[PDB]
Amino acid sequence: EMEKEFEQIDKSGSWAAIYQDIRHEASDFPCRVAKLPKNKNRNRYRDVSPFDHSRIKLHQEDNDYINASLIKMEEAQRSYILTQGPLPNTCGHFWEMVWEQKSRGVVMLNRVMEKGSLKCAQYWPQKEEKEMIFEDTNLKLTLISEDIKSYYTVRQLELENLTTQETREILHFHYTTWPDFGVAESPASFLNFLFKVRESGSLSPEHGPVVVHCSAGIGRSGTFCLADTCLLLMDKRKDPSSVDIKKVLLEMRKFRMGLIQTADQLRFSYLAVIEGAKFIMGDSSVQDQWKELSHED
Length: 297
Ligand code: VO4
What we know:
Blueprint: H1 2-12, H2 15-25, E1 55-57, E2 65-73, E3 78-83, H3 91-101, E4 105-108, E5 113-114, E6 117-118, E7 132-134, E8 139-148, E9 152-161, E10 167-175, H4 187-199, E11 210-213, H5 219-237, H6 245-253, H7 263-280, H8 285-294
Helix pairs in contact: 2-7, 4-7, 4-8, 5-6, 5-7
The chain binds vanadate ion.
PDB class: hydrolase
Keywords: PTP1B, PTP, multiconformer, hydrolase
Assembly: monomeric
């Protein structure tokens, strides 16, 4: 059904019209805390801020601001934290957020350098023997192992609360071939990566919300969460036709501004959900088909 809607929009060539409608319908809530003068150096982009009602607050008395939003999909019963690529001065805040929110997975959809510019701090260690200590938030981070595939890398990290000496395993899922304001190479390649995140346990309700980011934490991050929630809703009722992608996106836009930054990303979201529906509706072999088509070795 979503498939036939997809074909209607393609034949009309009205992806831009549909996407601008979403933009005009999208919620508009205040971002007063993000705009305080004292927080200016905590925001990577002047025009990408968390709403006050849904922002993640750090558990510190000094300044609890971080550019991060809690997306709570009530009906699908999944939550995500969407955040910007950490800044040189906010890597401690980032890992403090991960600790306090009890997240098990971090999904990173960007490269540290994209289009010749630095999009994100190097906020996790690249070498086992060179751990990182974030002195402002009293956290230590150690690379434990790395599994490099052709277009994504999975890292096992150990996060230590230096104050309590509690340790935690964090899984890092790094998509390395998704261009800013672009789409993944194929649905199959995107779905293969999403299902790798799912199979790690990182999205399970026994854990805190997965942390999802790219550079701004809205475009690629929005595509990832939208596809996931749509597939989860379909799974819940085994009813692909009860899932209205545009309504799920607007619901997600109540928690964070600008989710999906281009009409082509919206169109890709449809493709990913339409294709992923094959798996959700009983055809477990398409998962293997996606892994082959993705060429991850
Ligand atoms: O770094 V993103 O522009 O896909 O929000």
